[PDB]
Amino acid sequence: AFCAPPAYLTHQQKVLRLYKRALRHLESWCIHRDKYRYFACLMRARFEEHKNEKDMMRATQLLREAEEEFWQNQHPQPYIFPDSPGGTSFERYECYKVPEWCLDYWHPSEKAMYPDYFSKREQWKKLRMESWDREVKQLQEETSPDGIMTEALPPARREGDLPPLWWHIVTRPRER
Amino acid sequence: QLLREHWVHILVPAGFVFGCYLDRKDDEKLTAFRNKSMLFQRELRPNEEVT
Amino acid sequence: KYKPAPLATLPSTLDPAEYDVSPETRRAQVERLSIRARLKREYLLQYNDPKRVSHIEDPALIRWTYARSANIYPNFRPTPKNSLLGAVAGFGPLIFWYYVFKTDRDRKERLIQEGKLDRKFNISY
Amino acid sequence: MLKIILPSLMLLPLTWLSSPKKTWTNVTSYSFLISLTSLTLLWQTDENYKNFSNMFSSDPLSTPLIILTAWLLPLMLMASQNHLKKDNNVLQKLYISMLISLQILLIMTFSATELIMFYILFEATLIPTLIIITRWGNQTERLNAGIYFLFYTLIGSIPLLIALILIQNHVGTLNLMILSFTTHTLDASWSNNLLWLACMMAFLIKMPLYGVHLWLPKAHVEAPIAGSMILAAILLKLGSYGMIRISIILDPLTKYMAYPFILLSLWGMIMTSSICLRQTDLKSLIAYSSVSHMALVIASIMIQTPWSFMGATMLMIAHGLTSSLLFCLANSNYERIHSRTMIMARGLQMVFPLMATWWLMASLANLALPPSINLMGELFITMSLFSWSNFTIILMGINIIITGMYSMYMIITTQRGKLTNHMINLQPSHTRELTLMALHMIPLILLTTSPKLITGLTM
Amino acid sequence: MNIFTTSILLIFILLLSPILISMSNLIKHINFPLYTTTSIKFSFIISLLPLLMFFHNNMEYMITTWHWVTMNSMELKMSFKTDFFSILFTSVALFVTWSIMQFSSWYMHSDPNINRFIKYLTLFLITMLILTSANNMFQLFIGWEGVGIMSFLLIGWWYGRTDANTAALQAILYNRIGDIGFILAMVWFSLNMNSWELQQIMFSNNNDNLIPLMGLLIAATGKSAQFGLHPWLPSAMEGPTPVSALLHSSTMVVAGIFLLVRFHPLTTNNNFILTTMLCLGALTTLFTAICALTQNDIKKIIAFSTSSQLGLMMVTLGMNQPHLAFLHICTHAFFKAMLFMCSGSIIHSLADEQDIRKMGNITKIMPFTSSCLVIGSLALTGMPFLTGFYSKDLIIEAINTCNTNAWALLITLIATSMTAMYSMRIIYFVTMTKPRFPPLISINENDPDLMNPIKRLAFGSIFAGFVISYNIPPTSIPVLTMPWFLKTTALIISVLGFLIALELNNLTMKLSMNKANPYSSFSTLLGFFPSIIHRITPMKSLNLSLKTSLTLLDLIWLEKTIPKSTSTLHTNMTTLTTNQKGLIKLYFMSFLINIILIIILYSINL
Amino acid sequence: SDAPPLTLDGIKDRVLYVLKLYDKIDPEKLSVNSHFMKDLGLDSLDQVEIIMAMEDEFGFEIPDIDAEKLMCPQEIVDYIADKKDVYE
Amino acid sequence: WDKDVYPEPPSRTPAPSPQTSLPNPITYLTKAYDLVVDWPVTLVREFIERQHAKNRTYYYHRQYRRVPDITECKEGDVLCIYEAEMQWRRDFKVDQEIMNIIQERLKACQQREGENYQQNCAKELEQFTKVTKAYQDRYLDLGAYYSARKCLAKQKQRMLEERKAARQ
Structure with missing residues (x-):
């Protein structure tokens, strides 16, 4: 969920995603893992049959019939993965997933204890301001005037210096 | 010194005093019907001066 | 099989207008991508901008609020079906409720004048 | 009185x-x-x-x-x-x-x-x-x-x-x-x-x-x-x-000089309580809630029944205090942010752990959770209106429902979600504002306890 | 006559004491969960005494502790009615809550705000005890709404589980839709009898008194689970299992039925209610049993089972066996709670996988919870002597023995079968097939705080039903004269359910590929009723609240009409009266017109 | 009843266990960087089924955006480590 | 506690017939309670009552002299109207409290009679219906601005109607 997708897609990924979805819904239909393996092998054969074909006509036709068959023979109540959407743990801990900047407003009587950890925050923030302005020119120099960009982010082409825009990713709290 | 600062705390008490005094003056007015009513008409027992 | 609806839209895959391979449509998609990437980058140059002591302003949010709150009467132009729906909502239901209440009260009044309606225990009212 | x-x-x-x-x-x-x-x-x-x-x-x-x-x-x-x-x-x-x-x-x-x-x-x-x-x-x-x-x-x-x-x-x-x-x-x-x-x-x-x-x-x-x-x-x-x-x-005169005003008051209670659902501006939501309750007050004032007057006074006092309190809370969340909007700040209760319990204790008093002078008044007024006609419990109930709805909508778009990440200006609670909340609340407790003071002419 | 009230107030004082401690500063030093658990234990030991004195005297009691107000011939006061119902419900609820508190103390480690959780639980408990042992309908409304809000909080304890917020909103909406009819009843009684108390209301045992009964009926349908307003019970499961049990196995749902039964005296002289209590409660024994055949989530299945049992009890009420209904509440609570307890143990042992579809071999890998789960499953089926029988089978006697509507009877028996059906479904999919769960394993159930509670609850679920059925005063007159095919119907039909479930679960194998059939899809999707209701009703209501009211009335017309009209009008009149140019040749002509006017007016008027 | 967290050695041993129980093409000797499509001549079907087996082995789910791009056991492990925040 | 006001019917207590070979728990239970709890409480109560008696204090009951009524009260004049209306408010409040007393005695009778409330709990219901017809014919449709004048208009209209009925 960190990297971002492209605008358009390709037949390749479309078919892959249909495959994974159908196999999950089959794991849900047919509970026993033996039956799941059996029917998964059957679906694999169904695919490998038309695999080598390349004609966009047959591609689109088979794909749009496959999606209809899938939507018409899918599982009403599928198998959701707890830690992912739909489950019974999604966001369950966000009520505890506080960010860091709540720290600054601590009271000194409290950060009195936990002294070591606060002895290292400064040298971390210090690791941010000293290398921020540079992280901008790396883009404002490479902000290709062509003006056709994606959401990707280039690394530190230099050594020693840090990458650009690491704050909103580093310091992201645990999952617990 | 300090009274120029710590005297202001005398007004409000003086205002309350003045208020109670003004209400006392009003109630001393309207003294009519002191005991002429028809539901609290006493005999003015001895040594018990008027309300 | 399946049909669309105002609630259960036609899901992503099945949409015939998807799977299109038009160069113009793909170019539109990539333009949307350029836009969205510029936006996210301008946003991330502030989410992490150090020396910051404040929050971010959401101008989309502000404009949405403006359009829901105060841009209404100026761009408002009265027309029929609009005046009509307004007069309806402002008159009809009040008058329906009113006929109801008046009929009920007159029933109660004539009943009592006859001297019938059992009012025992209606001591507090 | 001069003493005051x-x-x-x-x-x-x-x-x-x-x-x-x-x-x-x-x-x-x-x-x-x-x-x-x-x-x-x-x-x-x-x-x-x-x-x-x-x-x-x-x-x-x-x-x-x-x-x-x-x-x-x-x-x-x-x-x-x-x-x-x-x-x-x-x-x-x-x-x-x-x-x-x-x-x-x-x-x-x-x-x-x-x-x-x-x-x-x-x-x-x-x-x-x-x-x-x-x-x-x-x-x-x-x-x-x-x-x-x-x-x-x-x-x-x-x-x-x-x-x-x-x-x-x-x-x-x-x-x-x-x-x-x-x-x-x-x-x-x-x-x-x-x-x-x-x-x-x-x-x-x-x-x-x-x-x-x-x-x-x-x-x-x-x-x-x-x-x-x-x-x-x-x-x-x-x-x-x-x-x-x-x-x-x-x-x-007030027997037949009331039907239009009672009708308007009830219908307005309903429509405004509905708008309180989809009104972004928090203070506007609060204001329309106030309208919804003062409509009850008016419907109870006109028909001139003693139960009705006592309920009017109860609900009057209750709404006064509760609205002052809700407005304090709004202002509080505003000085840190400077935007009335409800959907901007979200998912608090992770940094203002207590304040919520000054948010909650207000809503519950808005949606007529007992034992509260709020519900006592709403209920006595509904009684008077039922006597005055059997076809008003309908509107009383619709209002009660829509209130039970938007009060919680307000609680949940400001103290129930997940915390934003660009509101670094969240100066923690001030003892002063906590005190204001406590002072607006406590009297509600004492009056829920002994309301004989707050009844009206008829009691 | 002094020990009694002493105890009845001491239990409330005990439950208060922790809450008070919550205010104080000791919690950071003290084990609040154990504190509260033990206070609850002693509250139960206290509550027991009333039971002994009551079975030994059968003397109900009525009390008026505190006088609140005097509102001009309609007073108010904290009045209690310690009769069979409440004096027994207190003990049952505490016997359950002690175990639940131990289970929580064990199940919610690694969580910081556990003392907060405990305080919330005991607050709900106080409110429910109030509702139970209360007499004034006002005190009862207090209990009602306090229970509602406590359930809201508890379903939302994890205030990031987005759908949990919506579940809580569902709950509040439906509980308010019940409160509507409840206030209706309060008003009708305060008018037609001047009082709110059951004592002075019993004298309504002669009149039509139908509107308040409809009100209490809607209150039941709301706070309990019935046809129109069940959908809020399955979603609560999104919350934790301890509360999904306490607040949704023996409390917050039995409240409506408790109310109806306390109001039974007026329900024996209304042959309409006696009927509508069957086309409303028996139906739910079908519109949920159906949904209790394909649902995979343990908690959802259990909740649908609970709705089924509650519909059954509303049915027996409709046909006038209220003490039977109450006894069934009591018994039902025990095992319907032990099931959620075992399920929570299972889950916490695993990585938060409610789904049966990813568990198995539970017997071997975990004998204790499986034995207890089988106990509960058979008790709910109606095993002859497991505290289920002692109410369920008398109820199934009366249901066929009385003049009960045909379709109602029929779907009720069908549901009595579907009980065994989905019970054996649990059994098979969780306890008899292969270990389809992940490879890693960190099982642990040798902990006492989780092994003792289930033990106590099993002893209870096995004994208390019998004990009560033999110790309570024989409220009603039974019927013990019928054929065997009507005295043993529940037994026979549950055995049928066992056989059928075995056949079908074994058919699940054999590589018999599945097919999305509409009956089963319906069952799984609840019947599409939520899928349409919660997707049109909100949309239309909100779109109306926006289009008509906000814009088309409060921002457009009520402004274009009064203020902007006045503005335009005065603006135009001012434009006129100051469009004047400075020309005397004109000002004087105007003066002349005015002089003419004045002369003519005087001439006419003489 | 919480078991202990996951470490890199455990993750690696498990992943090798699974990719070895695999039968199609793996010659039972997988280099940590034994590229699937390049260094083992695998198929997209096989890679996707591998990702799915890993999802089942670790409970959670891997999104498509990264399932389609994972082409190295070391990359799978780096992903899991940056998702569960291991190795304090 | 005026018992002539609050009846408190008798208490036909039953007798103990413990025919078995097992001991009554209540015996020992209530004995231990009355032992440990009532002893200190009773001693403390005696202490408090002794301090009371040594520093005793009395207080009387306010007796409001009577006055003329609205009838013998000329219109326009007020003083009389006020000294009548306040007396009337006192009477109104007293009647309301009487209603409360009736209702309390009624609920008592009901519970104390238990399931036989339909037979032995019918006497008090008659006092109730009578008192309530009175309170109705007196204070039913006045209005929160109720007062002796409106009550008198009520009485007078009712008298006129009854008299027209009698004459025909």
Whole structure:
């Protein structure tokens, strides 16, 4: 969920995603893992049959019939993965997933204890301001005037210096 | 010194005093019907001066 | 099989207008991508901008609020079906409720004048 | 009564001459002393009403408002002590003086007998409010808001005055309880009907119906915490008190001079409670809720039943306090952010762990969770309206439901989601604002405990 | 006559004490969960005494502790009615809550705000005890709404589980839709009898008194689970299992039925209610049993089972066996709670996988919870002597023995079968097939705080039903004269359910590929009723609240009408009266017109 | 009843266990960087089924955006480590 | 506690017939309670009552002299009207409290009679219906601005109707 997708897609990924979805819904239909393996092998054969074909006509036709068959023979109540959407743990801990900047407003009587950890925050923030302005020119120099960009982010082409825009990713709290 | 600062705390008490005094003056007015009513008409027992 | 609806839209895959391979449509998609990437980058140059002591302003949010709150009467132009729906909502239901209440009260009044309606225990009212 | 007023007339020069470092604390504590002394009125041993002169008086229906006002003064002060912090000492002193003048006027009017004195005070309430709203707002439309406020109020004021004159001439005097002991009945013609109108129209325009609820949101939004407080708490209540004290004469007209107003009040309660669902602006939501409850107040005032009057007073006091509290909370969340919008700040309760329990304890009092004077009033009023007709429980219930809905919608779009990540300006709770919340709440507890004080004329 | 009230107030004082401690500063030093658990234990030991004195005297009691107000011939006061119902419900609820508190103390480690959780639980408990042992309908409304809000909070304890917020909103909406009819009843009684108390209401045993009964009926349908307003019970499961049990196995749902039964005296002289209590409660024994055949979530299945049992009890009420209904509440609570307890143990042992579809071999890998789960499953089926029988089978006697509507009887028996059906479904999919769960394993159940509670609850679920059925005063007159095919119907039909479930679960194998059939899809999707209701009703209501009211009335017309009209009008008149140019040649002509006017007016008027 | 967290050695041993129990093409000797499509001549089907087996082995789910791009056991492990925040 | 006001019917207590070979728990239970709890409480109560008696204080009951009524009260004049209306408010309040007393005694009778409330709990219901017809014919449709004048108009209209009925 960190990297971002492209605008358009390709037949390749479309078919892959249909495959994974159908196999999950089959794991849900047919509970026993033996039956799941059996029917998964059957679906694999169904695919490998038309695999080598390349004609966009047959591609689109088979794909749009496959999606209809899938939507018409899918599982009403599928198998959701707890830690992912739909489950019974999604966001369950966000009520505890506080960010860091709540720290600054601590009271000194409290950060009195936990002294070591606060002895290292400064040298971390210090690791941010000293290398921020540079992280901008790396883009404002490479902000290709062509003006056709994606959401990707280039690394530190230099050594020693840090990458650009690491704050909103580093310091992201645990999952617990 | 300090009274120029710590005297202001005398007004409000003086205002309350003045208020109670003004209400006392009003109630001393309207003294009519002191005991002429028809539901609290006493005999003015001895040594018990008027309300 | 399946049909669309105002609630259960036609899901992503099945949409015939998807799977299109038009160069113009793909170019539109990539333009949307350029836009969205510029936006996210301008946003991330502030989410992490150090020396910051404040929050971010959401101008989309502000404009949405403006359009829901105060841009209404100026761009408002009265027309029929609009005046009509307004007069309806402002008159009809009040008058329906009113006929109801008046009929009920007159029933109660004539009943009592006859001297019938059992009012025992209606001591507090 | 002078014992309540004179000190409130001394807080002014006190404020003027006191030094900056000390005026706040001095005036605050002394206003609290005034609030304390304001309880002498509660020594209502027997039923003989209190009368201090031909110029003042008290009553069970007025005393609550008096104490509530003398106790909302200092809360306005305190809630007005973090903003205008970079405004000059003279300006903040002006602000204090305006607040105090409001207090004094409200006391004198809720006490006075002669409705003409009541009226001049009811109309002098404006100047301080208009000023507070124009000279200390935070947006630009505050001007139009003040204009609407003023002119609605004065349009109401005029025919009220004309009818007071007609009365003072036909009848000999205007003093209350004399109006009672020498009232009479009217031939019930168009003349007396338009008289009923010219007498109630102002009080209604103030206590908003569906038709004229327009100046409330603009005020409560463009205006600051203190103006919002005082509006939602008292400047509405003035209309209710006037109507109660004056309807004593217009019998029987108010049997058939009510159907339109009752209908409007109920329908407006419903439509405004609905809008409270989809109204972004938090303070606007609160204002429309206030409209929804004052509609109940009005429907209970008209039909003139004792249960109805006691429920009206209960709900009146309850809403006053609860709305002041909700507005404190809104302001609080605003000073840290500077945007009224509900959907911007979300998923709190991870950094303001306590404050929530000052958010919660308000909603529960809005949606009529018992045991609360709120529900007692709503319920007695629903009883009176059921007696007056069997087909009003419908609207009572629709309103109850939509309230139970939007109160929680408000709780959940500000204290139930997941925390944003660009609101670094979340200065933790101030002891001051926590104190304001606690002070708005605790009296609700004590009155839920012993409400015999807060009943009304009939009890 | 002094020990009694002493105990009845002491239990409330005990439950208060922790809450008070919550205010104080000791919690950071003290084990609040154990504190509260033990206070609850002693509250139960206290509550027991009333039971002994009551079975030994059968003397009900009525009390008026505190006088609140005097509102002009309609007073108010904290009045209790310690009769069979409440004096027994207190003991049952505490016997359950002690175990639940131990289970929580064990199940919610690694969570910081556990003391907060405990305080919330005991607050709900106080409110429910109030509702139970209360007499004034006002006190009862207090209990009602306090229970509602406590359930809201508890479903939302994890205030990031987005759908949990919506579940809580569902709950509040439906509980308010019940409160509507409840206030209706309060008002009707305060008018037609001047009082709110059951004592002075019993004298309505002669009149039509139908509107308040409809009100209490809607209140039941709301706070409990019935046809129109069940959908809020399955979603609560999004919350934790301890509360999903306490607040949704023996409390917050039995409240409506408790109310109806306390109001039974007026329900024996209304032959309409007696009927509508069957076309409303028996139906739910079908519209949920259906949904209790394909649902995979343990908690959802259990909740649908609970709705089924509650519909059954509303049915027996309709046909006038209220003490039977109450006994069934009591018994039902025990095992319907032990099931959620075992399920929570299972889950916490695993990585938060409610789904049966990813568990198995539970017997071997975990004998204790499986034995207890089988106990509960068979008890709910109606095993002859497991505290289920002692109410369920008398109920199934009466249902066929009385003049009960045909379709109602029929779907009720069908549901009595579907009980065994989905019970054996649990059994098979969780306890008899292969271990389809992940490879890693960190099982642990040898902890006492989780092994003792289930033990106590099993002893209870096995004994208390019998004990009560033999110790309570024989309220009603039974019917013990019928054929065997009507005295043993529940037994026979549950055995049928066992056989059928075995056949079908074994058919699940054999490589018999599945097919999305509409009956089963319906069952799984609840019947599409939520899928349409919660997707049109909100949309239309909100779109109306926006289009008509906000814009088309409160921002457009009520402004274009009064203020903007006045503005335009005065503006135009001012434009006119100051469009004047400075020309005397014109001003004087105007003066002349005015002079003419005045002369003519005087001439006419003489 | 919480078991202990996951470490890199455990993750690596498990992943090798699974990719070895695999039968299609793996010659039972997988280099940590034994590229699937390049260094083992695998198929997209096989890679996707591997990702799915890993999802089942670790409970959670891997989104498509990264399932399609994972082409190294070391990359899978780096992903899991940056998702569960291991190795304090 | 005026028992003539609150009846408190007798208490036909039953007798103990413990025919078994097992001991009554209540015996020992209530014995231990009455032992440990009532002893200190009773001693403390005696202490408090002794302090009371040594520093005793009395207080009387306010007796409001009577006055003329609205009838013998000329219109326009007020003083009389006030001294009548307040007396009337007192009477109104007293009647309301009487209603409360009736209702309390009624609920008592009901519970104390248990399931036989339909037979033995019918006497008090008659007092109730009678008292309530009175309170109705007196204070039913006045209005929150109720007062002696409106009550008198009610009485007078009712008298006129009854008299027209009698004459025909």
